[PDB]
Write a protein that binds this ligand. Structure first.
Ligand SMILES: CO[C@H]1C[C@@H]2CC[C@@H](C)[C@@](O)(O2)C(=O)C(=O)N2CCCC[C@H]2C(=O)O[C@H]([C@H](C)C[C@@H]2CC[C@@H](O)[C@H](OC)C2)CC(=O)[C@H](C)/C=C(\C)[C@@H](O)[C@@H](OC)C(=O)[C@H](C)C[C@H](C)/C=C/C=C/C=C/1C
Lengths: 107, 95
């Protein structure tokens, strides 16, 4: 599964409809808080279209739950992420990942 | 050889390359489907369309290549990502 826990709420009616572009700011870290990637360090929002299997599954189902403005922590079990194979050099096998993601805007 | 815009050529090249690396963990394949595209660039814009695209996206795609070269020398894999940051930027702009 994927676990969403509000850090800061949005309007709670403007959800990303399948096929929109989510502009978001995230910091990703491994379970222990070890940061691996953040768009906020580059000072540059990440964009992706929701539904096109463009991102990992915990993101697909996680971000679909979010409304514009909302900031959330996603706890994504390896099944809904990079699995047993990981992504070599950055995400190890089986890793439970935590994402802090804020949904800036839909386009 | 065949007629195709550098636009279409790079769009589907970048998409295929990314799927091979990210999706299949095939860093051998992604170099295969990327080296050709880079080869053309290094040879020359012939038409006006290939000229302007080169003015727009030539620099980024070049730097992306140096990052891949850097990966080849160090095995770091964060060079590959700094490369794919730049590929993503040119791809996002050419849609
Ligand atoms: C340098 O930075 C990398 C991302 C880094 C690499 C390593 C991971 C730790 C990480 O640090 O991201 C990371 O924090 C992370 O885990 N992310 C990124 C943020 C969203 C969530 C997750 C993710 O899903 O990554 C994604 C993960 C790595 C792979 C995917 C997982 C889901 C699966 O369905 C896909 O199958 C193939 C692959 C990477 C992405 O978010 C990028 C946008 C998308 C893709 C590569 C594919 O969807 C591809 O499909 C062919 C596309 O359609 C794209 C648009 C085509 C163009 C040319 C490719 C662009 C390249 C973008 C690359 C980027 C920004």
């Amino acid at each position: 599964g994927v676990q969403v826990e509000t850090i800061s709420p949005g309007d709670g009616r403007t959800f990303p409809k399948r096929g929109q572009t989510c502009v978001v700011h995230y910091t990703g870290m491994l379970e222990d808080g070890k940061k691996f990637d953040s768009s906020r360090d580059r000072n540059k929002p990440f964009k992706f279209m929701l539904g096109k299997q463009e991102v990992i599954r915990g993101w697909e189902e996680g971000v679909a739950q979010m409304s514009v403005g909302q900031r959330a922590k996603l706890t994504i079990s390896p099944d809904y992420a990079y699995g047993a194979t990981g992504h070599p050099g950055i995400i190890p096998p089986h890793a439970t990942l935590v994402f802090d993601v804020e949904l800036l805007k839909l386009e | 050889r065949v007629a195709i815009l550098w636009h279409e050529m790079w769009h589907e090249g970048l998409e295929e390359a990314s799927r091979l690396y990210f999706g299949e963990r095939n860093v051998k394949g992604m170099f295969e489907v990327l080296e050709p595209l880079h080869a053309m660039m290094e040879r020359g814009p012939q038409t006006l369309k290939e000229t302007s695209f080169n003015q727009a996206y030539g620099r980024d795609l070049m730097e992306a290549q140096e990052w891949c070269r850097k990966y080849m020398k160090s095995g770091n894999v964060k060079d590959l990502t700094q490369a794919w940051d730049l590929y993503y930027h040119v791809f996002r702009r050419i849609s």
